[PDB]
Amino acid sequence: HVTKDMFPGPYPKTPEERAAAAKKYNMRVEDYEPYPDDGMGYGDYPKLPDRSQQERDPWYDWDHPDLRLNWGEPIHWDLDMYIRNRVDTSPTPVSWNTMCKHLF
Amino acid sequence: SSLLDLIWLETILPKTTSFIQMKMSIMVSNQKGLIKLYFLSFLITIMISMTLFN
Amino acid sequence: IRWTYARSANIYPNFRPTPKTSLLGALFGIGPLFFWYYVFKTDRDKKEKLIQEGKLDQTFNISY
Amino acid sequence: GSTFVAYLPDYRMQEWARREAERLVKYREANGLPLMESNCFDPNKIQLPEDED
Amino acid sequence: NVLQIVRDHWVHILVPVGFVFGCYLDRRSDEKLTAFRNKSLLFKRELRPNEEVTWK
Amino acid sequence: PDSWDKDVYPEPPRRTPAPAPQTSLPNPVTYLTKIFDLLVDRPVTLAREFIEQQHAKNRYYYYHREFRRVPDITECEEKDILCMFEAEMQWRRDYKVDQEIVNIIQERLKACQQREGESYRQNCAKELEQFTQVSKAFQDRYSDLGAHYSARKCLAKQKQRMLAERKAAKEAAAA
Amino acid sequence: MLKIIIPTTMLLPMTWMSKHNMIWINATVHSLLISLISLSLLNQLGENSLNFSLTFFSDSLSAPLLVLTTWLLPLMLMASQSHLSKETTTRKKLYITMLILLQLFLIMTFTATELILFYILFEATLVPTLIIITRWGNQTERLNAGLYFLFYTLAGSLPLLVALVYIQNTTGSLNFLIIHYWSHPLSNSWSNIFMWLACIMAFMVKMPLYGLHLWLPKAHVEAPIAGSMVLAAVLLKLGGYGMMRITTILNPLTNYMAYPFLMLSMWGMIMTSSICLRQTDLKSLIAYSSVSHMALVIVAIMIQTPWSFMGATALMIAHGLTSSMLFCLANTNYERVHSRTMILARGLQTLLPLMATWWLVASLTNLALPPSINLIGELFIITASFSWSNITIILMGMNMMITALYSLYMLITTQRGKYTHHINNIKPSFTRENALMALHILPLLLLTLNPKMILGPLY
Amino acid sequence: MNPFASLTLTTLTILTIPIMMSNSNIYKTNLYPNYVKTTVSYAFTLSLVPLLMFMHTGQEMIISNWHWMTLQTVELSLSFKMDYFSVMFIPVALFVTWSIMEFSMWYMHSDPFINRFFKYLLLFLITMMILVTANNLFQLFIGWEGVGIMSFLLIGWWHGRTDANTAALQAILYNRIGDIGFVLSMAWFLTHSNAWDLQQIFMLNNECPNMPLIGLLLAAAGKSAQFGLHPWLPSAMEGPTPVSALLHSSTMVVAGVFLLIRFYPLMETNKLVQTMTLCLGAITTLFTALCAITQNDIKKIVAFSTSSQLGLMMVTIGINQPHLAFLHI
Amino acid sequence: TMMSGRPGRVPLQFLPNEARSLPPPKLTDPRLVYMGFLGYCSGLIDNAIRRRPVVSAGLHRQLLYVTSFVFFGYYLLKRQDYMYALRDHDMFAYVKSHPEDFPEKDKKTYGEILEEFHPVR
Ligand SMILES: CCCCCCCCCCCCCCCCCC(=O)OC[C@H](COP(=O)([O-])OCC(O)COP(=O)([O-])OC[C@@H](COC(=O)CCCCCCCCCCCCCCCCC)OC(=O)CCCCCCCCCCCCCCCCC)OC(=O)CCCCCCCCCCCCCCCCC
Ligand SMILES: CCCCCCCCCCCCCCCCC[C@@H](O)O[C@H](CO[C@H](O)CCCCCCCCCCCCCCC)COP(=O)(O)OCC[N+](C)(C)C
Ligand SMILES: CCCCCCCCCCCCCCCCC[C@@H](O)O[C@H](CO[C@H](O)CCCCCCCCCCCCCCC)COP(=O)(O)OCC[N+](C)(C)C
Ligand SMILES: CCCCCCCCCCCCCCCCC[C@@H](O)O[C@H](CO[C@H](O)CCCCCCCCCCCCCCC)COP(=O)(O)OCC[N+](C)(C)C
Ligand SMILES: CCCCCCCC/C=C\CCCCCCCC(=O)O[C@H](COC(=O)CCCCCCC/C=C/CCCCCCCC)COP(=O)(O)OCCN
């Protein structure tokens, strides 16, 4: 049911196709930001914040309460890296550097 | 997963083979159909056989 | 669908050979192989030298 | 088929090897022979090549 | 009812016929490799009073 | 039990102490083993005797297969395939028998270690030394042959071992 | 050997003369009967072989593979019964014909007294699999997958034909018995090096060796369930069987020739196990797990020790059974969801408890839990590699840990958690699927009682 | 004849009958937990007799009843070691399991899958008995992995909770890190001593080298949650309280210390491995007590107490006092 | 090899007169049965192409195809066997007539042959 134009494409170089890509991924143009146009094949895919899924709001009524995701929302490239069963980025009461120094 | 498997291993054997074969096919099959060039090549070929194989 | 397609099938058409990609691919795909080859070759050369010299004490070593 | 495989006759000859080993060890211990021998074949029947170096 | 279920169930006999034919062909091919029967140095045996071949 | 040879599997006489009760208290072990005997060993013995008489009602025999000796690989021609086949089969049978001999020696060693208890390091020197000889011999005969082993490779290994021994003996005598 | 071959051939006229609604029943019954006949072959001797005739022989290396091949066909028919419901009778008969022809080619391949016959059948297996993949395939990438699968194999195996004809011209025979008895050492020469490469690469590419494994994920993901079952269970073991048969003439050249391939396999098991951790597709994950297992089998064959060979045989059989079961479970999920994505259908243990039990048992067997034969082969190969070099233990342990990690990851992602709310078409599991899983899993736990049946000729 | 062996095998055999009846009608009724508890109590009172015989005399036996397979010169058979350690640990474990199961009949009363929970407890107990009485390395590995799998299944008992699954996978990860060293030790012993049997290993190892003992120490540290691989044990409190009382408190987590005890004849002939064991135990007990001193969850506090006690046990192993460590267990 | 120029060979004979001294192939030869199978397949394909009931459209036509294939296969087998017999005959005659090129190799036993042993480690 998904059409050809609804699939990810190449890196956007013009503002018009930047806006088209932002519209395709269901987000604002000002909030849209692709990965840097390096050799790796990210192409046209939003570079979402690297925040984990554990630190999303546990009180919002998500369509997927376990994964804390909403239907139709753009999915982070590394979603399976942050699934509340794996590495999380929740802020800690003590800073990372101080913790490392104390532990070491 | 990506850098090696989906990119470089794919580039080495299969993509390189496909690219080379397609380029050679384009070069070989891109002939305008003029007997001028064909028999000029035949003349060039005939001369080479006489002087290079004996 | 977009997530899975971008993760799996949209990689190569957007790939471009760059100094970064070339260097990282060469390192991550060649360096470990030669490192492990050197390690195992040195270990086996040492073991063979000890066996030829006869000072390894392989008593009770029946199954291999 | 599982029952058939369970009751397959010994064509691999395991208990036969057990009996052969038992009788050989009985013979060798009794006669003072030192069990197993280092050479698999008797050296009398091998003609080594003289080096003369 | 015989002569009616046969027209629908005749196919079942084919795999089994193949098995017995294969056994027969295996024995027939075995019959051509008797050049050393009772001639091996390990199982060289004198025949029984009512024995023609050690194995078939 | 007559089911196995006592010479192949030697055992000490198994001397055991006698009960010397120092007190008047009745120990529970004897009462428990008596009730165990009455409730277990008797029905089991009766069932075994019934099964044994049923077996004695129908008795039949099976025999150990004897194999003749055949020429070995050292007296086979270069491309003679029949004698090579016979020698290879004989060598494989000998290899199996050697493996089972090593198995017997290992079983002896394990039984000695378990039986001797806390003094195994001294009371099992004989089994350890026998196992040392058998392991050394077995190792010399079959080590490093590889997955595709054969009588020819074993003969080549023995040949090079004897060449090395002859060279060492000549160098030592002529020292 | 013809007592197995002839009934398999008669399967074709029986299928083509069957009623429109009785093809599956007859095919399953007669395939199961053929499998029972195959059980007799397992009895094996400690001596040379079961030399039936000049054309075919059987061995304790070929017997378990033949039994597995004969056993797989009824399971493939059971799996294929579902998605071919809306297919015309002629095309269903053609599908069954393809499966029967593939079984016949595999059966004749595993006996194969002579090496050119082995090559001919080893290549004849390529056509029915290609037709199955590119005809009864769901996606549009099946054509590219079939092209990859065909051309990798053919590029690998074309030099093998030249090597074999050269070997027969020089030695004079390609019968395996004469080859074994008249074996001669290979001198360290460039011509001998290239002959070794031509003899080895054809079987390496079908293992698949790491770096030459690209075709396998495509072919496995795009194939129908029966094709995936056969590819993961039997077609991968052809390379291992060929290497075991052909390494007899490659000595002593193999001692140093093996290093490039040993390093590739030892690092590639880690690479593919780590790849399995980040995968969004069940079939791709199972395929990469297969790649890791076959790389470890490659290591075992290259080490070339008796324990290596026994472990390799046991691991080949165990991996075939386990991968077939895992693919069947994935197909059962797919036929309900039609997505083939791990994260879509979640918490299926609440809805399908018995299928969750099947998932758990399959994951435990893939995890190599003792005393399963998977761990028997794994441990034998690990011990042989340790005797080869004590430093291999690090890589083997890393592979074991990552293997357990992604196996339990695959189990937890699909079976545990909260069910997806909007998915409401998850019907109760049918008796057919449950029987398929049971017939996959029970032979493994029965074989662990008699491990000597799958330990090969060097037992 | 010599009822010692018959009784010791009978206890382990009768521990498995409810597992066979788990497909019968009693499994679908509410009498199954009482059935399993009665079976465990009968097994305990039955196993009390061989301990009594050992106390009277000191009976020691090895039972190699079934021969599984033989690879060349190596013979693998189902062998049970019924020494002091086995005949002393079995009654204690059975007593604790009986008490915990009677407790669970009350604690888990409202849980819909209680028959399953009880069945799992029985399965874990069977695996632990396999681990304790094993005579060769392969059987002890079988028990080693069985207890780990039962721990994984019982920790993630509430499979709808993400944290339970995370804790179960964490336990699996750390136990596999230990399994690496276990496999290294098995490979070394098979390559050099030509056996996985304990008797042959004890004969052929008068001065045991560093590698097999280091592998054994790594496996023991992995399964007993020493300082390097400690965090999985406190996270294992996600499971039900009876699970934390039986497995992760007193029966499963002493498996590494028991493994080091079983190989004590080789441990005393090496001085560097003893030093490493001592240092590991000391750092583990200190760090775990320091963690415990300030926790607010009671289960976490008691789990850190268990970890500190295991550290003290491994200190005792390090000072070459294995029987004292067994008594402390 | 090339037997085209072989002496005393007739220019267009399928089977020479000297070929009749060889045992003829049996009527139950597996190659003859395979030729009959080829004819049966040809008949089935002919039925399928003409859009007729494949199994039971023309029995006479299928019989004719099978018979023709069997006949030609029998004659082809005769000629093939004769050609291989000629090859072997010429081989043996040439070996007989040139003793110096095919000397008898001095038979040697393995107990007195030194072969290098390569350990597998
Ligand atoms: C290893 C050696 C051993 C095995 C040898 C293997 C080959 C054997 C057979 C060789 C060829 C001869 C027969 C083929 C004729 C073609 C006619 C046909 O299509 O079948 C329709 C016909 C049934 O349909 P129908 O109701 O008559 O009318 C439908 C129309 O015909 C038309 O219906 P439609 O137009 O409505 O349907 C259209 C359909 C129909 O289109 C077709 O099916 C065309 C047929 C395939 C092409 C044949 C190529 C020539 C031979 C090549 C063999 C290659 C083998 C090498 C291995 C690689 C495999 C590719 O086409 C499609 O659907 C398009 C998609 C195609 C799918 C993918 C294509 C793959 C084809 C590769 C087939 C290769 C194996 C063939 C096996 C037999 C197949 C019939 O089938 C038959 O009944 C005849 C089959 C044989 C009869 C056996 C009866 C004897 C049993 C009783 C005596 C017992 C014997 C033992 C004696 C002792 C017992 C007491
Ligand atoms: C569900 C709830 C529980 C109910 C069930 C309760 C009962 C429990 C019993 C289940 C397992 C308990 C273990 C008991 C084991 C006893 C049986 C064992 O002793 O027999 C084994 C025998 O088992 C068979 O050997 C193995 C089974 C055969 C496996 C072949 C698979 C069948 C074909 C299917 C297709 C193949 C696919 C895979 C291709 C290779 C080993 O016997 P062995 O000591 O050795 O010698 C046999 C006796 N001799 C001396 C006379 C010869
Ligand atoms: C891509 C994904 C993986 C695919 C599979 C890869 C596996 C194939 C690798 C082939 C294995 C090695 C080939 C040859 C090994 C022999 C050892 C030799 O290379 O080492 C030195 C050889 O020295 C130099 O290497 C000479 C060769 C140099 C030219 C080779 C090109 C080097 C890189 C090519 C790699 C390309 C591979 C992919 C091809 C498409 C030893 O010095 P020397 O004592 O004198 O020679 C001993 C041999 N003798 C006795 C017969 C003479
Ligand atoms: C596709 C497979 C090939 C099919 C071939 C067509 C089948 C129909 C042809 C019908 C029979 C034609 C034979 C003609 C009758 C008499 C022939 C005879 O008079 O001529 C002889 C010649 O006999 C023919 O050559 C034999 C033809 C037999 C062809 C079959 C061989 C096919 C290869 C193996 C594939 C199996 C095919 C089996 C199914 C048909 C004498 O030749 P000669 O004057 O001295 O020298 C000329 C030839 N030289 C120069 C090469 C030496
Ligand atoms: C997945 C793709 C893999 C494709 C296969 C890659 C390896 C291919 C193997 C090399 C190709 C040639 C095989 C040789 C055939 C066997 C014959 C033989 O061994 O005899 C040698 C013949 O040896 C050769 O001629 C080899 C020449 C090589 C020419 C073809 C080159 C093809 C590519 C070679 C490099 C790549 C090989 C490894 C590829 C790695 C994987 C991609 C000796 O010939 P003689 O002259 O009779 O004896 C000498 C005394 N007078």
Q: Which chains touch F (3 or more CB pairs under 8 A)?
A: C, D, E, G, H, I
The DSSP secondary structure of D1-53, one letter per residue, reads -HHHHHT---SS-HHHHHHHHHHHHHHHHHHT--SS-S-SS-GGG--PPP---
Interchain CB distance below 8 Å, D46 and I112: yes
For ligand 2, atom 25, name the residue with the nearest CA: D6
**Residue showing tokens 């009602």:** F57
Largest CA-CA distance found in chain F, in angstroms, rounded: 85
Determine the structural domain holding residue E26 and report its residue range.
1-56
Our mutation pick for probing the ligand 1 site, out of E7, E14, E15, counting the most ligand atoms within 8 A of Cβ, is E14
CB H221 within 8 A of CB H213: no
**CA separation for the pair F35, A28 (Å, rounded):** 87
- Gap from CA of B1 to ligand 5 centroid (Å): 32
CA atoms within 13 A on the CB side of C39: 15
**Residue showing tokens 């290596």:** G308
What are the residues whose beta carbons fall under 8 Å from the beta carbon of H19, sequence distance 6 or more?
Answer: H119, H122, H123, H126
Please count the residues of chain E: 56
Q: Which of residues 101-120 of F touch D (CB under 8 A)?
A: 101-105
**CA separation for the pair H59, H68 (Å, rounded):** 26
User: Is B6 within 8 Å of chain C by CB?
Assistant: yes
Enumerate the β-bridge partners of residue H136: H197
User: Is C8 within 8 Å of chain G by CB?
Assistant: yes
User: Is G447 within 8 Å of chain D by CB?
Assistant: no
CA neighbor of G1 nearest in space, from G63, G92, G88, G82: G63
CB H81 within 8 A of CB H135: yes
User: Is G211 within 8 Å of chain B by CB?
Assistant: yes
**CA separation for the pair G74, G33 (Å, rounded):** 10
**CA separation for the pair H196, F110 (Å, rounded):** 11
Task: Judge residue H7's burial from the number of C-beta atoms within 10 Å of its C-beta, 0-12 exposed, 13-18 middle, 19 or more buried.
Answer: buried
In a domain, I121, yes or no: no
Closest ligand 2 atom to G321 CA: 38
**Strand, helix or coil for residue G112:** coil
Total domains, chain I: 1
Interchain CB distance below 8 Å, G280 and A80: yes
Chain G residues in contact with C33 (beta carbon < 8 A)? 263-264, 267
Q: Between chain C and chain G, are at least 3 CB pairs below 8 A? A: yes
User: Is I121 within 8 Å of chain C by CB?
Assistant: yes
G84 CB under 6 A from ligand 5? Answer: no
Interchain CB distance below 8 Å, I111 and D46: yes
**CA separation for the pair F70, H52 (Å, rounded):** 60
Q: What are the backbone dihedrals phi and psi of residue I19, each rounded to the nearest 5 degrees, phi first? A: -70, -15
Residue G427 is classified by DSSP as P
Total domains, chain E: 1
Q: What are the backbone dihedrals phi and psi of residue H63, each rounded to the nearest 5 degrees, phi first? A: -120, 105
**CA separation for the pair G448, D37 (Å, rounded):** 37
In a domain, I103, yes or no: no
H-run or E-run covering G309: helix G306-337
**Can you state the angle between helices G306-337 and G237-246, rounded to 10 degrees?**
170
**CA separation for the pair G408, H159 (Å, rounded):** 13
G159 CB under 6 A from ligand 5? Answer: yes
In a domain, I119, yes or no: no
Q: Work out the number of other CB atoms within 10 angstroms of the CB of residue B1.
A: 19
Q: Would you state the structure tokens that stand for residue C16, as one six-digit string?
A: 């471009």
Our mutation pick for probing the ligand 4 site, out of I76, I81, I83, counting the most ligand atoms within 8 A of Cβ, is I76
The DSSP secondary structure of H258-300, one letter per residue, reads HHHHHTHHHHTT-SHHHHHHHHHHHHHHHHHHHHHTT---HHH
Q: Would you state the structure tokens that stand for residue H164, as one six-digit string?
A: 């339970």
H-run or E-run covering H135: none
Q: Measure G306 CA to nearest chain F CA, in Å.
A: 5
Determine the structural domain holding residue I25 and report its residue range.
1-98
Q: What is the resolution of this structure in A?
A: 2.7
What are the residues whose beta carbons fall under 8 Å from the beta carbon of G349, sequence distance 6 or more?
Answer: G356, G415, G416, H159
In a domain, I24, yes or no: yes
CB H150 within 8 A of CB H120: yes
Chain C residues in contact with F143 (beta carbon < 8 A)? 61-62, 64
Q: Which chains touch A (3 or more CB pairs under 8 A)?
A: B, C, G, H
For ligand 5, atom 49, name the residue with the nearest CA: G191
D5 CB under 6 A from ligand 2? Answer: yes
Q: Which ligand is nearest to the CA of G210?
A: 3
**CA separation for the pair F99, A93 (Å, rounded):** 66
**CA separation for the pair B13, B19 (Å, rounded):** 10
- Which amino acid would we find at residue H160? G
**Strand, helix or coil for residue C61:** coil
In a domain, I108, yes or no: no
Q: Which ranges in G369-416 belong to alpha helices (H)?
A: 373-388, 392-415
Q: Which ligand is nearest to the CA of G64?
A: 2
Closest ligand 4 atom to I38 CA: 39
**CA separation for the pair A68, A58 (Å, rounded):** 8
**CA separation for the pair E56, D21 (Å, rounded):** 33
| Angle, CA G121 vertex, CA G116 and CA G125 arms, to 5° | 150
**CA separation for the pair G104, G232 (Å, rounded):** 18
